[PDB]
Write an enzyme that holds these catalytic residues in place. Structure first.
Site, short mmCIF file in Angstrom:
data_model
loop_
_atom_site.label_atom_id
_atom_site.label_comp_id
_atom_site.label_asym_id
_atom_site.label_seq_id
_atom_site.Cartn_x
_atom_site.Cartn_y
_atom_site.Cartn_z
N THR B 1 0.59 0.52 4.93
CA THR B 1 0.90 -0.07 3.61
C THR B 1 1.11 1.08 2.65
O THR B 1 0.36 2.02 2.66
CB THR B 1 -0.26 -1.01 3.27
N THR B 2 2.09 0.93 1.81
CA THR B 2 2.26 1.79 0.68
C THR B 2 2.53 0.89 -0.52
O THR B 2 3.42 0.07 -0.48
CB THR B 2 3.43 2.74 0.99
N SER B 169 1.91 3.35 9.46
CA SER B 169 1.45 2.03 9.09
C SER B 169 2.25 1.42 7.95
O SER B 169 1.86 0.37 7.46
CB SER B 169 0.00 2.10 8.70
#
Lengths: 226, 228
Positions: B1-2, B169
């Site tokens: 996730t960002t 991710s």
């Protein structure tokens, strides 16, 4: 037997125990209040029974938050109960919502709370009208919650025994133009005219405001302006 | 996730990649991690999808009730405060990085980071997610504040792209939304028009020289590409 509990309507859809609590407010000392463009001023005539009270005794005006206050009219103890509930609402607004409670909201909450005690056989209505004076983000605001829990906004307002006269005197004021400075003078002046001297021999007039000069903090006004 | 959010004059951009991963497999390659709380207040969610969806739904609910009750707009501070409360009450049982960002007329655009411990910090911009560790230097080096809306959108897209080019991710789309006085503009850059990736950076086109052919010299030539 139609009038013993607030849980009951009369045949005309009145609730007598509320009208009766109402009379408690009308037989009480007079309050007035004015909502200007720069703030709210509320004043109230404290009637002492003793010559030996401390000045400060039986304050009828309470702060409820930085920006809001409640002046009680009627049974002072019942009012301190409302003041406590108002304060819990104000705290909640700050604790949960991280905002000062808007005044319309505060007065609604106060009304809901007062009304609740007009619905259930086990409690009685409150014998006090709260005047709420706020100056939060909704601007200067003046509401009154009566014992029925009915809430109304006002430019100016008068409660208690001299209410009918005090309203006549408050009608002479120009609410569009009037400032918190002038109002402290006027509202206090009004409570001196309508005070009846041969009945209530001992009295001070407590005044409080929340306005631009007070940094929108609700405070008793310094006893130089009175 | 960002996930990240940035302030500009008069509003905020939120941005996020779209990937939800069960470790090393991508269960969702088009998740929406920009979650609406009110009209002009959004969160970006990172951590446990379950947890963050449950909190966002809860906070959005509370805030709609609250808006109907006070009859006025909600402040971003209120939304952040509630989020913080809930994140802190449940800090032991949830994995949840939040950013709450949005526009309200009193305070303009705001950004709050609410990281795992349930701190709430008001910032100019905020980063969250596993991918955020890659953007700190990117912001330190390349983010100047005072950007226009459009500059700020492009910068957040770049920033997400940089992050998800290195974080395994994070990945997929880049979703953004702007939030200011005007209507919210959501946008979605698909991966194949990402404004950065390693697979198209010219400085990563030459292959590392690992598979040298057997030679009579120490002079390094190239990888052995063919048997002959």
């Amino acid at each position: 037997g139609h009038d013993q509990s607030t849980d009951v309507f009369s045949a005309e859809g009145r609730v007598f125990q509320v009208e009766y609590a109402g009379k408690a407010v009308d037989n009480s000392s007079t309050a007035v209040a004015a909502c200007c463009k720069d703030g709210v001023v509320v004043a109230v005539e404290k009637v002492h029974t003793s010559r030996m009270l401390e000045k400060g005794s039986n304050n009828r005006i309470h702060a409820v938050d930085r920006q809001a206050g409640i002046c009680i009219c009627g049974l002072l103890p019942d009012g301190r109960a409302i003041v406590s509930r108002a304060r819990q609402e104000a705290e909640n607004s700050r604790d949960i919502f991280a905002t000062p409670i808007r005044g319309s909201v505060l007065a609604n909450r106060v009304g809901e709370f007062m009304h609740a005690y007009t619905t259930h056989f086990a409690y009685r209505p409150f014998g006090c009208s709260a005047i709420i004076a706020s100056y939060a983000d909704d601007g200067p605001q003046l509401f009154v919650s009566d014992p029925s829990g009915t809430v109304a906004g006002y430019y100016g307002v008068a409660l208690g025994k001299a209410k009918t006269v005090a309203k006549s005197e408050l009608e002479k004021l120009d609410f569009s133009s009037l400032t918190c400075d002038e109002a402290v003078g006027k509202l206090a002046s009004i409570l001196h005219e309508v005070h009846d001297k041969q009945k209530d021999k001992l009295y001070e007039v407590e005044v409080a405001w929340v306005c631009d000069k007070s940094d929108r903090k609700f405070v008793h006004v310094p006893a130089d302006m009175v | 996730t960002t996930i990240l959010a940035v302030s500009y004059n008069g509003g905020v951009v939120l941005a996020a990649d779209s990937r939800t991963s069960s470790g090393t497999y991508v269960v969702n390659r088009a998740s929406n991690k920009l979650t609406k709380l009110t009209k002009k207040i959004y969160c970006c969610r990172s951590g446990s999808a379950a947890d963050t969806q449950a909190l966002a739904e809860r906070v959005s609910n509370y805030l709609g009730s609250y808006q109907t009750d006070i009859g006025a707009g909600v402040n971003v501070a209120t939304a952040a405060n509630l989020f913080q409360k809930m994140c802190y009450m449940n800090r032991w049982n949830i994995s949840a990085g939040i950013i709450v960002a949005g526009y309200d007329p009193i305070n303009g655009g705001s950004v709050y980071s609410i990281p795992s411990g349930g701190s709430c910090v008001k910032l100019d911009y905020a980063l969250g997610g596993s991918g955020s560790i890659f953007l700190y230097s990117f912001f330190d080096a390349n983010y100047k504040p005072g950007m226009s809306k459009s500059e700020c959108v492009a910068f957040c897209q770049r920033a997400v792209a940089h992050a998800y080019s290195r974080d395994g991710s994070s990945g997929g789309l880049i979703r953004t939304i702007t939030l200011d006085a005007d209507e919210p503009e959501d946008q979605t850059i698909p991966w194949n028009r990402s404004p950065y990736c390693m697979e198209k950076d010219p400085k990563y086109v030459t292959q590392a020289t690992q598979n040298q052919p057997f030679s009579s010299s120490a002079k390094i030539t190239g990888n052995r590409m063919s048997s002959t």
